[PDB]
Amino acid sequence: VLLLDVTPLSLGIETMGGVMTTLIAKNTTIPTKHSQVFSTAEDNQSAVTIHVLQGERKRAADNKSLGQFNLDGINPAPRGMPQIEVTFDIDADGILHVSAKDKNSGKEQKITIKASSGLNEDEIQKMVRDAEANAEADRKFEELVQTRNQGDHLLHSTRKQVEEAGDKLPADDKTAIESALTALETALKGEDKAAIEAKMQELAQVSQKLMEIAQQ
Amino acid sequence: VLLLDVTPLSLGIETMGGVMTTLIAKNTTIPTKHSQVFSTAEDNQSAVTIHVLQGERKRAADNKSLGQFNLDGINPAPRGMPQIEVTFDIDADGILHVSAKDKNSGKEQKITIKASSGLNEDEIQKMVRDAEANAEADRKFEELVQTRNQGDHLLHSTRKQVEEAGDKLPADDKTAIESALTALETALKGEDKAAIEAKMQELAQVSQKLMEIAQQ
């Protein structure tokens, strides 16, 4: 063959923290099909928005939104335990079928995206140039989001542990731990990587007993 | 300047599943310093081996081992909660100082690696060619390890939940759940991605009540 039908840009979904996570890489020959198992961001979460993105930027908002749908009826479970399988399937005509399947509930939902959706040739070139020009800014956004995600999981896990310990956790211990959780949650509302990391470290420094107890 | 001192290859550490995780990318100008926070792979783990690797392959064993050390005295906590900060610092002379700091215990350990350690120019070219020739095999190894890691965390989390539920979990429920845990753990000892995923899915299909209970 002299030509191939290939994707001009990355295809994926928005994930926790406002980041684009790629399911089909740029320059993949079609037809193609790729699945990845994802999960809930918080304990007992009953629904996920699957938000389909096209582009090369790390920030979800900087890419081209192709459409979105919900999968609900996710049954109560700890954060990150339900198995939500997301599949991108591009058929021979270039139509994209995105589906999300909750292996724990059985429920499935899909959206169909026309081959003509998304960015046109000029906008595709602009996207590629943009990703090149902002490769550093995007790297910094990416590392801030992973640190903001780590802090949010540490915040939520420690709150659960506190409540589970109840009276077993000495007053002083609880005081130091609570103080630090509030400090972290404030840092998480902000934009500063190092501040989030310092509040995380402040928490590791006073949580010793809580851990111990939680492990008993 | 007409020349720069730059790394010829990736530097990092071995992580859970026998994978190389990069701390300093290939072609970084020295001096340079990079930290990433890592953690324990199992509940109550008291020590981590920091195993310093040089190279471009995903499998740890396929890269060049520069040395290793332990950090112990990690205090009991749930898997993934202790904050273990690993820092690679290459100074102006090309000497690499790797340290690991447990923010929760305060304990620190380091190793110093001479600038002349690791692969020579020929071996560096061979490494680069090898990574090129095996880019697919390495991608498949990488995805198998992430699936094997996900199953191992799901195995370990579900075992904890079972034990915590004790008598609250109906016999039948427990039976189906236990069956599936054994099936997963066997799949994890194997080499087959799809088999691991099917055992995970078998577990999501019978764990509904356990989750519910665990969430109460």
Binding site: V37, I50, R79, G80 | -
Partner: peptide, 13 residues
């Protein structure tokens, strides 16, 4: 359990 106001797709443990 109280269900959170959260829609984010997260990573599978």
């Amino acid at each position: 359990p109280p269900r959170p106001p959260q829609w984010a797709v997260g990573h599978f443990m």
